[PDB]
Design a protein around this ligand. Sequence first.
Ligand SMILES: CC(C)(COP(=O)(O)OP(=O)(O)OC[C@H]1O[C@@H](n2cnc3c(N)ncnc32)[C@H](O)[C@@H]1OP(=O)(O)O)[C@@H](O)C(=O)NCCC(=O)NCCSO
Ligand SMILES: CC(C)(COP(=O)(O)OP(=O)(O)OC[C@H]1O[C@@H](n2cnc3c(N)ncnc32)[C@H](O)[C@@H]1OP(=O)(O)O)[C@@H](O)C(=O)NCCC(=O)NCCSO
Ligand SMILES: CC(C)(COP(=O)(O)OP(=O)(O)OC[C@H]1O[C@@H](n2cnc3c(N)ncnc32)[C@H](O)[C@@H]1OP(=O)(O)O)[C@@H](O)C(=O)NCCC(=O)NCCSO
Lengths: 240, 240, 240
Amino acid sequence: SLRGTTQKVNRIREITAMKTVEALQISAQLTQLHEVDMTRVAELRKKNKPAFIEKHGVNLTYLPFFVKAVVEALVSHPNVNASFNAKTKEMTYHSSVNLSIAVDTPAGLLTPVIHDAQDLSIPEIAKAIVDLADRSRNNKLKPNDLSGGTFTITNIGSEGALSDTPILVPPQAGILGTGAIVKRPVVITEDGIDSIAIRQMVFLPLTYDHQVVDGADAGRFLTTIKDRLETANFEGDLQL
Amino acid sequence: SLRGTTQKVNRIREITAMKTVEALQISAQLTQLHEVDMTRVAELRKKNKPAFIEKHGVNLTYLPFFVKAVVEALVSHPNVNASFNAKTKEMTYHSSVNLSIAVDTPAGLLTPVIHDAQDLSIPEIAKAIVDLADRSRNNKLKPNDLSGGTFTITNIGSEGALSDTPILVPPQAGILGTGAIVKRPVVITEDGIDSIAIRQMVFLPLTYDHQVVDGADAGRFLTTIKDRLETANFEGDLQL
Amino acid sequence: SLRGTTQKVNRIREITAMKTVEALQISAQLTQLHEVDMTRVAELRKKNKPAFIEKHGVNLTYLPFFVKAVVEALVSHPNVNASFNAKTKEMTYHSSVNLSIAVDTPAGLLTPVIHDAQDLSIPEIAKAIVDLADRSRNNKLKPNDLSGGTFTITNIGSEGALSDTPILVPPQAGILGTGAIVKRPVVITEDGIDSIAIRQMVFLPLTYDHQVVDGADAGRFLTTIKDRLETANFEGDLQL
Ligand SMILES: CC(C)(COP(=O)(O)OP(=O)(O)OC[C@H]1O[C@@H](n2cnc3c(N)ncnc32)[C@H](O)[C@@H]1OP(=O)(O)O)[C@@H](O)C(=O)NCCC(=O)NCCSO
Ligand SMILES: CC(C)(COP(=O)(O)OP(=O)(O)OC[C@H]1O[C@@H](n2cnc3c(N)ncnc32)[C@H](O)[C@@H]1OP(=O)(O)O)[C@@H](O)C(=O)NCCC(=O)NCCSO
Ligand SMILES: CC(C)(COP(=O)(O)OP(=O)(O)OC[C@H]1O[C@@H](n2cnc3c(N)ncnc32)[C@H](O)[C@@H]1OP(=O)(O)O)[C@@H](O)C(=O)NCCC(=O)NCCSO
């Protein structure tokens, strides 16, 4: 029991405390928020969940769709998949997308990495997330699993949040949160008629480092992700 | 008249300027946002307002309901009612909930404290808020009224805001804002039917220090508060 | 092509990286968010767009309406059109409103200034924005165009964002973002009846420096802007 005691924090939480305090002091963080209509992805996921778990052995969640769209956008917007050397004033644009994934564990938050995520299909991403989350929760990560990330995705919606202002950790330039996907009434406009529909909506807060990305660059990057998700042409990508 | 002059700032505003600049540099602040359906609380408040002011002598606002739920959640999530000693790497989990309440005054913002708020009923909380706000506005606070807080609640909705990213002040680990409670169209899902209802909704932004609380801990804490408020089993708590 | 290279950043981006990192360390930034019903302004803009471009020579966007309301509010709330000298603890309340406007350019974000914006009509503001954006994009700004700002407006909605937490740059005390104006279902309450209407809504995030502005001051300032925009008495102001 913790109430009424003073205790040394565990090793995961000691590193998190030092890294997050320092990260804010050596970058210029801000969080831009876009809304995305996830209805088509939600319909595709519900329809294909049984066939996906039968063929690939893991449950199909929303996270592999967010990962696929974000990784494609990091290839299309290489200025976001980049790091700034504040001493030399040089930007390095990475040729791999090594995608960090935040994992909640009882001992603390861990952020393992999917290396070369740009080469992965949706089934490969789904399996990799399940593997890294299981190894994070059971003390089986190696140093290469926790280093080399070029961008991070954090599932803030897992515990119900609509949004957050996640802390990025240099040398990364961005961290995207996937808010809780919620049914909401929204306006549709088609043929000059405005009307109210029920759609599965999500907020995507992107914390970006203003040293690397300006606000309009963040918006163009998030627009690429939004359009990919809203069109939801992922049937082929599921390999079912 | 202020326009076109240069003047020394008053004592309240000098301390606020120094404390807030320093607070951000010695913590890792981020703000997670959840939405809560306040309809049942709003109905209970409207129904019982006359009996409450008759028996307890103060107007019944939303703030005592937010205080009751937050204080219960600070007891249930002792990891949030805590402080981090960055020199020793030790966490202290406080056995009292001393709840700071932000009060807007013409001379500046003051943050007096309701000590041992965990022992208070809703009528006691309502009276304590009225007392501290009156003493803040009339120069009658003592040093013990302004020290010892373990968490803060700030009514950002008083002047119309939906949300904010409030600044926490170490050694506290969290500050919760109560946004403006607004009627909104929302989706209800029951019996497999999705439908649109008008509900009194609020956003609750929580700024937390990542040295003390990870994002999933913040979400679990806010979920406890959300469920308590949405169920709205406070009839007995009003003592009417 | 950038992917797989390390290159020196351009002059605009070098200054932006240094200025934004420093700005956060010498101020106490937080972002308060209000929602505003832009339907009446959108109707007035659609109705008068052809006559405005015919008489004044520039397209009428939403930005001149936001500028007019913000500039009036900076005159009415001189405490926001101000700077803090942290060495002397003195506040200077500026007698001009020199309004910085963020401009996205291919070489990087530039923030030129509309000096003495308080003396300008909506047609003058529209022309000044077009002039400064064209000169920012074609290397024709002078040092006086980039200095002396007392507040900034940044059009975060240009690239689709609903909101952001813009970084203010001392000695300014506030930066207001104009989110994307989107049709949304909202609740109207009139004659004791609650009902759902389709309205053009916008989020206005204001980043303010807590050294200069407390949360309730930010709310009162944003309320003045919200009421001016929602009433939308700008017909005369268009000079058509
Ligand atoms: C210079 C400027 C501010 C001018 O903005 P503007 O006055 O809105 O002009 P514009 O870009 O020509 O407007 C194009 C259209 O978009 C509309 N629009 C622009 N902003 C909008 C918003 N927030 N919501 C809805 N519509 C918007 C305009 O009304 C105009 O509509 P029509 O074609 O139907 O008349 C803009 O070009 C720009 O650079 N914006 C980006 C600022 C920036 O980079 N900020 C940094 C933080 S994030 O971007
Ligand atoms: C490892 C992982 C990211 C995996 O997430 P995941 O791929 O969504 O898997 P999961 O937790 O098994 O998903 C459980 C269910 O919730 C759903 N879900 C998860 N996130 C969701 C979201 N943002 N919106 C809606 N539904 C969501 C999944 O689709 C799945 O649904 P079904 O049971 O109907 O198929 C997650 O367990 C986790 O640790 N999240 C927290 C991350 C964190 O702590 N971040 C720090 C900042 S705040 O939390
Ligand atoms: C001291 C206090 C917190 C007390 O707040 P309170 O308990 O809500 O009392 P109040 O101001 O008398 O309430 C007036 C009315 O507004 C309502 N109200 C207050 N906050 C509300 C909110 N978030 N949403 C909806 N209604 C609200 C109350 O319920 C009450 O309604 P009725 O008159 O219908 O009964 C407040 O006066 C204050 O100072 N708030 C500002 C705090 C501040 O400056 N924070 C800094 C960050 S931004 O403001």
